[PDB]
Amino acid sequence: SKTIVLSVGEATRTLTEIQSTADRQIFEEKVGPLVGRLRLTASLRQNGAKTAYRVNLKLDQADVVDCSTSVCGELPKVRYTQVWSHDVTIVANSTEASRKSLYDLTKSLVATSQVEDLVVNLVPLGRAYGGSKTIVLSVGEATRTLTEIQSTADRQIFEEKVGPLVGRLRLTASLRQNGAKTAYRVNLKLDQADVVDCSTSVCGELPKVRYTQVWSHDVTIVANSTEASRKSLYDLTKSLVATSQVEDLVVNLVPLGR
Amino acid sequence: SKTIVLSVGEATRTLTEIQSTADRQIFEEKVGPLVGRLRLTASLRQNGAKTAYRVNLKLDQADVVDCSTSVCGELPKVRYTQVWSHDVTIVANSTEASRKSLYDLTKSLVATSQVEDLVVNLVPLGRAYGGSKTIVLSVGEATRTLTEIQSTADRQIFEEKVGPLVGRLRLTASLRQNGAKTAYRVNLKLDQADVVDCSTSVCGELPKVRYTQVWSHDVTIVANSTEASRKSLYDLTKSLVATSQVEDLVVNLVPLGR
Amino acid sequence: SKTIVLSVGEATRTLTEIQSTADRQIFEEKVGPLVGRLRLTASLRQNGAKTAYRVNLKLDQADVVDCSTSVCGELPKVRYTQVWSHDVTIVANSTEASRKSLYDLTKSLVATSQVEDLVVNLVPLGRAYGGSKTIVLSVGEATRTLTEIQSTADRQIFEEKVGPLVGRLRLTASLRQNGAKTAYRVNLKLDQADVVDCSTSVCGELPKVRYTQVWSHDVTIVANSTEASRKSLYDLTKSLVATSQVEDLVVNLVPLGR
Amino acid sequence: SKTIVLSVGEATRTLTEIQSTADRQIFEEKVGPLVGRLRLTASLRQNGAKTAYRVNLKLDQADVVDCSTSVCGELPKVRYTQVWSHDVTIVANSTEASRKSLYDLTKSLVATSQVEDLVVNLVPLGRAYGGSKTIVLSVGEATRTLTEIQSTADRQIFEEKVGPLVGRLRLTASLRQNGAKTAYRVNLKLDQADVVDCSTSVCGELPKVRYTQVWSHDVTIVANSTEASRKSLYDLTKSLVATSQVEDLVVNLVPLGR
């Protein structure tokens, strides 16, 4: 019926819709046993006085092993789950090119090879070639190069240096491990403030920000994983953001599934 | 998701569903800016001793304007909203030809040239073509001509004249303006009573009414509107009633959206 | 002694009665070890002021495995348990054709290929071929086609469109998973209200319902099942309803076992 | 389940068991409509200091009528009920030949033509064939003739005349109508006292009674009955006492149901 396909190269893993509430919308892959499958929980709200929407994707991935042939008399069983949530904040009175460019940066943020090593191999962001540690975010041919301005114990704040100080691109990456060293937690956050200048119309007007639009990430990685399991979780989220269904979910708020 | 299509000629405007409660069911169009869009708040109830249903549609339409080209640094914003509500009352023990004729008369009530001029150009109802002030509601080749019986300063009651005197068609139009003369209020209402007689079965039995079924309207038009703002509100509601889903919502009580 | 024979094709699984209370009546299959066997708990009550009976079947199925040959020194054990309950409501002053038609629909509801895929492959009911999603319940050559009128988050309400609005066939399917995603719960419910018309005797008489009779289902499916274990649970319940002992239990209130 | 077979000639009416408490034991026929059926509320007790049992049967019979053919829109309904209770008292230290004789006299009491006309045509007991008003109770070839000793307005006492004066057979019939002359009440009761004489062992010992055993009856007949309604109630109770299960319920205290 209603499907999203996720190409991981030449192999496509098509999800099917299994549940549809007013806002929540649960997808699932219908191949294999019933105990652990791919999951995709989209949502869409508007918080407060109808002024800001809130998209919330969440891609689960359970590692199912079936040891019925080796060990006699047991069933398939979920080892662990690794999620990759999203949290997009879109303001209602925005222009289209602000939230299109927010999608274009996050599509190119996931697709780079530095966030690949952050999820798969847990290496922090930023690589220094000729100066400080930078991430390049090509949105086509234009490359918006962020530079690292801070390195805390876990936090790592990036920023673009072109333009005024009031509104700039941001990246507050993080990396933790909760409890008894059993699961990591990566947390990216890309802020995009829309600054405007009225100098050609009004005398002496310094630039100011109108609104702000974020795209948070929340990756959960368990410690005893397989490296091929962290690679497939990154490859599905890289393929999920690159689809045209999530493009219309952020730019035009069209729900998923066709 | 679940869509309704409203053909306004060759241009089709598809409204997708954004909410599904137990009774309320909200649709929106997804093309355009995020602040002013079409709206269709469908509903269904059964109040009292489970004997009468209540369909309740509401087609909002906001007129959004964006002149960031003119004024440097402004965002899109709606000026006014113009609605067209419906309130259908269906009794549960009806016959199917009662619920079908009530839909077929209101489908032809909206599609006439006298209700079009009533909401676009504010012209009152009734056009005297050789006789009394009459409205013709064609149901195909059967034409049902309602003649005006009373024109008060507020109300304007029409009524059919064939058949018995106890149960006949009604059309109670009205027109107000509340507040500081900023918005009008058109109010149509079509009463249909089911009359039956068995003088061939039971002697001395005169005709009497079993039940009645209404289809009232409540249009809100602001006084400083555009002409194509009022023309498009009529053209959408005329195309909403003519769909195959609002037919089955009245005849068979199945909710909207396929 | 007292037996029910469930044919699953050419193989017959003969249950024998092991316990008989006043109303409760427990059958069991006497083949194999003592730890997990087929179970069938019939019941029959009359709740309230002796006006309505309540038949309650429940077919258990435990999946045992004897791992003594591979693993040295261990016994057979029950991995999981999948049930299929029934809960029939029969009013005392019914017509025999009202009880026979309710059984004839439920015998044909279970025997269709859409309820087969609902408990085996967990896909919901209704298939759209030329219009909306329908289920065809043939009772011989007469096919009573239910059409889907609602699709909630889990609920799914079907209804037959022929006849009056007051009493129609209903079918409220459901699908859940309780707790930590470990067990599903399918829940069908077929309502059949008896409508009568007094128009040939009393004029002006609209049809009304005298009673209603339901046949609920309550399937429990655990998530780490074998597909051959869900197929075997459906195939026994498909053949249990098709027996002439459950026909006389609903139509004539004769207890099970001969 | 457990059945009693009441042969009424060539027609056999099989009651099946619907309840099994510690003492109460309800049977019911399963052929026909669900609202009016046969009923047999058997019981057994031992009241006091464990010295006397109490068998208690109750054969209800409801006259159900269904005329949905004549008047459109009604269901089957019970007009009246006619019962035939029994109240047997058995002392625990009895002789088996005394318990068998009490059964053989009551089996021959019900099977005579004077008790048949008492419940069908309300004719009182006793027919004078050359002498007093006598009842003949054939126990095969032995005939025990009871002559009438007292007939007041209510009671009608019969008594055997052979043997000693201290212990003799009894038959205390009566007939009432309680309420607004709508229902009768036939009440039979057969006393059997066991007398013994020890004059061959102990000198100066006159005969005396050691225990008594009763078998009461309590028939309820409504006044506006059908003749075949009272004739079928008599023919079922005549066939109930003649069974091999009510013989063992009195002689060997085995509960009903095989």
Angle between helices A96-110 and A227-241 (to 10 degrees): 160
Angle between helices D113-120 and D227-241 (to 10 degrees): 140
SS (H, E, C) B169-194: CEEEECEEEECCCCEEEECCECCEEE
Distance in Å, alpha carbon of C257 to nearest chain D alpha carbon: 7
- Residue pair D122/D115 in contact (Cβ under 8 Å)? The answer is no
Cβ contact C224–A35 (<8 Å)? yes
Nearest to B1 among A200, A201, A255 (CB): A255
Amino acid at site D96: E
- The CB-based long-range contact list for C15-24 (8 Å cut-off, 24+ gap) reads C15/C40, C17/C257, C20/D1, C20/D20, C21/D20, C22/D18, C22/D19, C22/D20, C22/D21, C23/D18, C23/D19
Interface test with A, best of B16, B34, B74 (most A CBs within 10 A): B34
In Å, what is the CA distance from C182 to each residue of A81, A234, C178? Answer: 15, 27, 7
| Resolution of the solved structure (Å) | 3.0
Tally of CA atoms within 13 A in the half-sphere of D190 that contains its CB: 23
CA C98 from centroid of its chain's CA atoms: 18
State how far the Cα of A55 lies from the Cα of A85, in Å rounded to an integer.
11
State how far the Cα of D84 lies from the Cα of A124, in Å rounded to an integer.
95
Q: Which phi-psi region, left, alpha or beta, contains residue D131 (left: φ > 0; alpha: ψ -120 to 50)?
A: left
Nearest to D120 by CA among D233, D7, D13, D205: D233
State how far the Cα of C24 lies from the Cα of C56, in Å rounded to an integer.
9
Residues in chain A: 258
Name the DSSP letter for residue A167: S
Distance in Å, alpha carbon of A255 to nearest chain B alpha carbon: 7
- Residue pair C173/C155 in contact (Cβ under 8 Å)? The answer is yes
Nearest to D189 by CA among D173, D175, D205, D176: D173
In Å, what is the CA distance from B63 to each residue of B8, B39, B223, C195? Answer: 18, 12, 14, 50
State how far the Cα of A236 lies from the Cα of A248, in Å rounded to an integer.
18
Amino acid at site B39: R
Opening angle at CA D153, ends D150 and D154, nearest 5: 85
Structure tokens at D35: 């609202």
Residues whose CB is less than 8 angstroms from the CB of residue D52 and which lie 6 or more positions away in sequence, other chains included: D46, D89, D90, D91, D92
Nearest to A219 by CA among A55, A35, A57: A57
State how far the Cα of D39 lies from the Cα of B123, in Å rounded to an integer.
79
- Residue pair B6/B246 in contact (Cβ under 8 Å)? The answer is no
Burial (CB count within 10 angstroms: exposed 0-12, middle 13-18, buried 19+), residue A214: middle
Structure tokens at B102: 């009530």
DSSP string covering chain B: --EEEEESSS-EEEEEEEEE-SS-EEEEE-SS-SSS--EEEE-EEEETTTTEEEE--BEE-EEEE--TTTSTT---EEEEE-EEEEEEEEETT--HHHHHHHHHHHHHHHTSHHHHHHHHS-PPS-EESSSSEEEEEESSS-EEEEEEEEE-SS-EEEEE-SS-SSS--EEEE-EEEETTTTEEEE--B--EEEEE--TTTSTT---EEEEEE-EEEEEEEETT--HHHHHHHHHHHHHHHTSHHHHHHHHS-PPS--
- Residue pair B132/B147 in contact (Cβ under 8 Å)? The answer is yes
In Å, what is the CA distance from C52 to each residue of C44, C253, D34, D35? Answer: 11, 12, 10, 10
Experimental technique: cryo-EM
Cβ contact A34–C79 (<8 Å)? no
Structure tokens at A129: 């070639």
Burial (CB count within 10 angstroms: exposed 0-12, middle 13-18, buried 19+), residue D41: middle
In Å, what is the CA distance from D124 to each residue of A155, D113, D119, D161, D241? Answer: 110, 11, 9, 21, 22
C127-128/C133-138 β-pairing: antiparallel
In Å, what is the CA distance from B37 to each residue of A21, A33, B10, B27, C258? Answer: 22, 43, 20, 10, 68
**Helix, coil or strand: residue A109:** helix
Cβ contact C151–A20 (<8 Å)? yes
- Residue pair A35/C224 in contact (Cβ under 8 Å)? The answer is yes
Residue A192 backbone phi and psi in degrees, to 5: -140, 100
Please report, in angstroms and rounded to a whole number, the separation of the first and last CA atoms in chain D: 8
- Residue pair D192/D105 in contact (Cβ under 8 Å)? The answer is yes
Residues whose CB is less than 8 angstroms from the CB of residue D89 and which lie 6 or more positions away in sequence, other chains included: D52, D53, D54, D212, D213, D214, D215
Cβ contact A34–C67 (<8 Å)? no
State how far the Cα of C151 lies from the Cα of A15, in Å rounded to an integer.
20
State how far the Cα of B158 lies from the Cα of C57, in Å rounded to an integer.
62
Residues whose CB is less than 8 angstroms from the CB of residue C8 and which lie 6 or more positions away in sequence, other chains included: C232, C235, C236, C239
In Å, what is the CA distance from A151 to each residue of A116, A123, A148, A171? Answer: 20, 14, 8, 12
State how far the Cα of B43 lies from the Cα of C29, in Å rounded to an integer.
53
Structure tokens at A35: 């105990």
The torsion defined by the Cα of A22, A27, A30 and A33, in degrees rounded to 10, comes to: -100
- Residue pair C249/C255 in contact (Cβ under 8 Å)? The answer is yes
Tally of CA atoms within 13 A in the half-sphere of B136 that contains its CB: 9
Nearest to A173 by CA among A114, A128, A131, A226: A114
**Chains A and D: 3 or more CB pairs within 8 Å of each other:** no
Name the DSSP letter for residue A207: P
Nearest CA in chain B to C200: B201
Amino acid at site D217: H
The b-or-e profile of C162-177 (16+ CB within 10 A means b, else e) is eebbbbbbbbbbbbee
Number of H helices, E strands in chain C: 4, 19
Q: Which residues pair with C26 in a beta bridge?
A: C19, C41
**Helix, coil or strand: residue A116:** helix
State how far the Cα of C57 lies from the Cα of C41, in Å rounded to an integer.
6
Nearest to B30 among A20, A23, A253 (CB): A253
Angle between helices D227-241 and D96-110 (to 10 degrees): 160
State how far the Cα of D61 lies from the Cα of D41, in Å rounded to an integer.
12
In Å, what is the CA distance from A129 to each residue of A132, A136, A139, B244? Answer: 7, 12, 21, 65
- Ranges of beta strands (E only) in chain D are 3-7, 12-20, 25-29, 39-42, 44-47, 52-55, 58-60, 62-65, 77-81, 84-91, 127-128, 133-138, 143-151, 155-160, 170-178, 183-187, 189-196, 208-222
Is C220 flagged in the annotation as binding? Answer: yes
Most distant CA pair in chain D, distance? 82
Which residues in C lie closer than 8 A to residue D31 (C-beta atoms)?
A: 252
Most distant CA pair in chain A, distance? 82
Nearest to B93 among C149, C203, C207 (CB): C207
- Residue pair D65/D100 in contact (Cβ under 8 Å)? The answer is no
State how far the Cα of C58 lies from the Cα of C155, in Å rounded to an integer.
23
Residues of B with a Cβ under 8 Å from any A Cβ are 1, 16, 18-21, 30-31, 33-35, 68, 72-73, 75-77
CA D94 from centroid of its chain's CA atoms: 21
Q: Which residues pair with D171 in a beta bridge?
A: D158
Interface test with A, best of C224, C227, C230 (most A CBs within 10 A): C224
State how far the Cα of D34 lies from the Cα of D48, in Å rounded to an integer.
39
Burial (CB count within 10 angstroms: exposed 0-12, middle 13-18, buried 19+), residue A110: buried
Burial (CB count within 10 angstroms: exposed 0-12, middle 13-18, buried 19+), residue D82: buried
**Chains B and C: 3 or more CB pairs within 8 Å of each other:** yes
Tally of CA atoms within 13 A in the half-sphere of A227 that contains its CB: 5
B143-151/B133-138 β-pairing: antiparallel
Nearest to B168 by CA among B135, B194, B197: B194
Structure tokens at D71: 């008047």
Structure tokens at A166: 């009031």
Nearest to D3 by CA among D27, D39, D19, D37: D27
